[PDB]
Amino acid sequence: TAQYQVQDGVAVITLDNPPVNGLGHSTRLGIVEGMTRALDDAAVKAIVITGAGKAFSGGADIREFNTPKAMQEPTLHSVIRVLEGSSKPVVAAVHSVAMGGGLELALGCNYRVASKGAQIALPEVKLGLLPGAGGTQRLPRVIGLEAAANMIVSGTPVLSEKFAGTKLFDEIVDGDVLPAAVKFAQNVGAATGPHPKVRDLKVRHENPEGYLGFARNTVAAMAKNFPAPLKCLEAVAGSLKPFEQGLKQEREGFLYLVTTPESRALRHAFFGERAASKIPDVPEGTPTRKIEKVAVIGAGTMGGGISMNFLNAGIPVTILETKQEALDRGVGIIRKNYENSAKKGKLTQEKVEQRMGLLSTTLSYDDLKDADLIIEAVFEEMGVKETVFKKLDEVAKQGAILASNTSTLDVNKIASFTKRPQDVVGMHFFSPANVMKLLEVVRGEKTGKDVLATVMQVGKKIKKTAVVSGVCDGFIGNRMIEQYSRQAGYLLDEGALPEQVDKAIEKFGFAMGPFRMGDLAGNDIGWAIRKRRAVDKPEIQYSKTADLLCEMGRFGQKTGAGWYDYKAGDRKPYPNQQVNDMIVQHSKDLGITRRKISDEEIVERLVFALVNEGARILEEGIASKASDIDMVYLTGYGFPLFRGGPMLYADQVGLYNVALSMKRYAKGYHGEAWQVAPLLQKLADEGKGFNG
Numbered sequence: 001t002a003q004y005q006v007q008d009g010v011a012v013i014t015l016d017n018p019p020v021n022g023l024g025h026s027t028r029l030g031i032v033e034g035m036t037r038a039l040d041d042a043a044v045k046a047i048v049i050t051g052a053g054k055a056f057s058g059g060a061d062i063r064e065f066n067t068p069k070a071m072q073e074p075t076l077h078s079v080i081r082v083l084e085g086s087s088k089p090v091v092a093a094v095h096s097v098a099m100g101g102g103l104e105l106a107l108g109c110n111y112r113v114a115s116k117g118a119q120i121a122l123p124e125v126k127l128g129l130l131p132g133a134g135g136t137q138r139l140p141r142v143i144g145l146e147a148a149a150n151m152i153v154s155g156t157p158v159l160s161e162k163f164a165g166t167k168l169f170d171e172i173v174d175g176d177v178l179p180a181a182v183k184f185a186q187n188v189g190a191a192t193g194p195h196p197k198v199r200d201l202k203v204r205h206e207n208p209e210g211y212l213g214f215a216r217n218t219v220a221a222m223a224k225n226f227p228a229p230l231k232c233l234e235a236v237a238g239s240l241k242p243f244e245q246g247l248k249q250e251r252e253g254f255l256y257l258v259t260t261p262e263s264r265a266l267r268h269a270f271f272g273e274r275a276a277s278k279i280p281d282v283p284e285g286t287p288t289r290k291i292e293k294v295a296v297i298g299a300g301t302m303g304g305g306i307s308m309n310f311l312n313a314g315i316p317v318t319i320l321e322t323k324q325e326a327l328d329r330g331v332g333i334i335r336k337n338y339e340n341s342a343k344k345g346k347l348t349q350e351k352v353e354q355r356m357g358l359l360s361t362t363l364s365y366d367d368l369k370d371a372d373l374i375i376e377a378v379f380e381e382m383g384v385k386e387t388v389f390k391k392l393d394e395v396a397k398q399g400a401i402l403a404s405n406t407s408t409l410d411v412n413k414i415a416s417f418t419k420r421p422q423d424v425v426g427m428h429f430f431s432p433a434n435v436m437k438l439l440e441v442v443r444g445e446k447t448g449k450d451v452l453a454t455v456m457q458v459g460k461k462i463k464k465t466a467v468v469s470g471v472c473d474g475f476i477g478n479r480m481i482e483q484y485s486r487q488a489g490y491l492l493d494e495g496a497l498p499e500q501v502d503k504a505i506e507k508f509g510f511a512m513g514p515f516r517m518g519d520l521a522g523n524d525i526g527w528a529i530r531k532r533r534a535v536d537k538p539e540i541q542y543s544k545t546a547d548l549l550c551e552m553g554r555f556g557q558k559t560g561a562g563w564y565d566y567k568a569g570d571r572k573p574y575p576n577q578q579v580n581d582m583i584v585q586h587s588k589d590l591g592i593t594r595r596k597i598s599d600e601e602i603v604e605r606l607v608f609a610l611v612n613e614g615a616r617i618l619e620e621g622i623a624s625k626a627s628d629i630d631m632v633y634l635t636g637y638g639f640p641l642f643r644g645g646p647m648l649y650a651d652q653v654g655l656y657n658v659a660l661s662m663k664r665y666a667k668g669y670h671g672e673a674w675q676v677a678p679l680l681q682k683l684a685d686e687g688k689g690f691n692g
């Protein structure tokens, strides 16, 4: 809504829709109703528009995105139209935040006055759109083409006081904006003659094609599969035309971006991060335990990684090791990670020391006595875990939460080594744990709901995207990546080589293909894993190619040699002759006439195996919703942000067509991998998606 108050011949319209005065329907209507009242009232000679609380306005109200109310009139286009055609002069009084539609509204007013320290932005590019209510046209008219292009392409905020000597603000003040804006309004409302409009100004620039040519290149190079940034630049270029043409060209830009799958993807990512925290049977308002101090068992790469997340947030950690060398080795790796980030400009050295100052080291379980959360990050062997969870079940205070960073061991079994299984939980971080955003939270059968609520809240405090998975081999991410890695192997049998598969799937948009990834993880890890599949009650086949590779001791980057070769301090993975002859021999030995596999088939086989298994995961309820699987693959596996995740991608492709492709692959090599998940078949039969 909008408050309306007359004071001293000035109507003040005050946007009020916390937390950021989102321009929702009721607020938009409110601004117009107020303007109607103001023009009607003879005593009112000028108008001030401002915002309550901690914003002028942060733009579109996100709680309206998917509603009709988003587009219900008056729209922002209609509101602005009302402000520009106002016979009485309109002064925007900006403070704190003026972003997106909020800036656009301010630019629609005759005059603008700001206080210092206000954040100014058009961030629409971050959602794959562009400023669609005149921003691309009015902004370059008040700050010039280059400054405007830069704000709009990048979406980055800029403090109000940095616009001194542009026309954006007619007066920049210290102190409160409103008093100064009312005084401003009083003067202008006592002159007549008509009042200026941003649309009458002209973008003056002495070589547009000079600049735009260079901007085109740098934007194209940085933009990489996102079409919004170039369209924003194009829209801004239109500010050189007469206002109405520019605006028509902007609207077309907007409507084109709105159709693109890339902005569908960014929107899915944005809302998926928010929906990740929702668990079907744990309602908001379920109360959480206070987590003030943390302990970690293990100072290896994970343990040291996990710890840094808590330190970065200001939460003290106590790392426990067996030996004083493993400790002082880990603490040194932590410190080397930080001082290093500091040289790349990610932190000051001061910040490094305040972080290291929150880290404690012990060799003894008695120091973990007042830790609210303890995270086990030790070797993957049930025997060792049993030792740690027994020692922890003695010491840990009553109410502490005990978590395992296991990625392969049964969380429920680790829990029954204690007499408080309701307090045990998976917290599966992803290597490197201080950079990868993904936290997989594994809910045990016994895990209490209060424990789950707490872990999610913690997740948020350490800036992870935390997704709840039930218990099964590989949880959500690894269970899916196994099916993907199986198709990769099978593609080698049939006629692919590692570099070929990696390059195809990297061009599709993965950060790193299956072979490069296995080389980075350590190919032996997977070797260990598969060897307890044929042991345990399954007989799922894999291509023997990865076994063979490991029988040569080509374990990856750690041995200097995996599917490729690696030379020191050199980023390139070099294709290896011994590996590629092994792959070609193996095909010879299997009876297979190797053939030419298309990049399209590589991608389809790999990505559709993620989708098939994701569909079984949803049917089993190991993930509560499809957007969570997507969030796992964006934040854990380097699935391209521009496609939104495997499950959104399959919907974009169309489930009916994904199903058909699968039935064709059911007839080729290892056809049993391509039976169609029943949930996928059913959604395909009914013309629905996983997401919508």
Ligand SMILES: NC(=O)c1ccc[n+]([C@@H]2O[C@H](COP(=O)([O-])OP(=O)(O)OC[C@H]3O[C@@H](n4cnc5c(N)ncnc54)[C@H](O)[C@@H]3O)[C@@H](O)[C@H]2O)c1
Binding pocket: 297, 298, 299, 300, 301, 302, 303, 320, 321, 322, 323, 326, 377, 378, 379, 380, 384, 387, 388, 405, 406, 407, 408, 409, 429
């Ligand atoms: N499930 C997985 O495969 C997976 C996934 C992520 C992390 N993790 C575990 O976290 C580790 C991080 O690095 P790392 O193992 O290379 O070296 P690490 O140093 O973290 O391995 C565990 C450390 O804990 C210590 N340790 C072993 N047993 C212990 C016990 N009973 N009590 C106390 N301390 C003990 C050892 O000094 C060892 O250095 C991972 O590498 C892995 O072992 C496992």
